[PDB]
């Protein structure tokens, strides 16, 4: 029964070291973010406002995706004059962020 439990545990584990190590690392990263967010919320209850730190650049031309719309491709110009649609979408977007 002990070797059957060991075989039952071995047959039902299909991942590997790198996959398992990656899962552990991902869980750790998620816990680290939740802890930092809680730390910021508790300091916000005390009035002190501290901003979220950015992940540091690993290389020189590393990209902050939040700062800039990235390799923006504009919709091809069309004959249908989408002018009021852009006004309504801007108003709804600013309303959302409000």
């Amino acid at each position: 029964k002990e070797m059957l439990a060991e075989a039952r545990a071995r047959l039902l584990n299909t991942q590997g070291k790198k996959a398992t190590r990656k899962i552990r690392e991902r869980m750790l990263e998620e816990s680290k973010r939740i802890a930092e967010l809680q730390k910021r919320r508790e300091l916000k209850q005390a009035g002190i406002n501290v901003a979220i730190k950015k992940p540091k650049k690993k290389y020189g031309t590393d990209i902050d995706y939040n700062e800039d719309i990235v390799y923006e491709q504009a919709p091809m110009p069309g004959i249908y004059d989408t002018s009021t649609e852009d006004r309504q979408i801007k108003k709804k977007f600013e309303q959302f962020e409000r």
């Binding site: 047959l11 039902l12 299909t14 004959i79 249908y80 004059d81």
Partner: protein
């Protein structure tokens, strides 16, 4: 028998939404231009904001209805078969895929 090609599938999807637009006008009837700016070159079409809203609502309703008709299919097919040995859900979906081959 057999499958349906994409040009025959698209017409039947187009024939189906015409019946949804027919009964939408029948359920409404039961209850009760082109301007081309020469400088820009743009063409502006003036249309009813109700029919544009009813277009945006019906696409969201069809998107949710197919979302819910697939979610129940996920919950049913997971709790149908448990005879053949599996390990995870991706093994079950693959061993079921072998069954439709034969």
């Amino acid at each position: 028998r057999g499958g349906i090609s994409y040009d025959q599938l698209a017409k039947l999807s187009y024939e189906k939404t015409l019946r949804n637009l027919a009964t939408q006008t029948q359920n409404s009837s039961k209850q009760d231009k082109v301007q081309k700016d020469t400088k820009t070159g743009k063409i502006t079409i003036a249309d009813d904001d109700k029919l544009v809203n009813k277009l945006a609502v019906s696409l969201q309703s069809e998107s949710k209805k197919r979302y819910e008709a697939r979610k129940r299919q996920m919950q049913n097919a997971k709790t149908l078969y448990g005879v053949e040995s599996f390990i995870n859900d991706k093994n079950k979906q693959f061993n079921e895929k072998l069954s439709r081959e034969s």
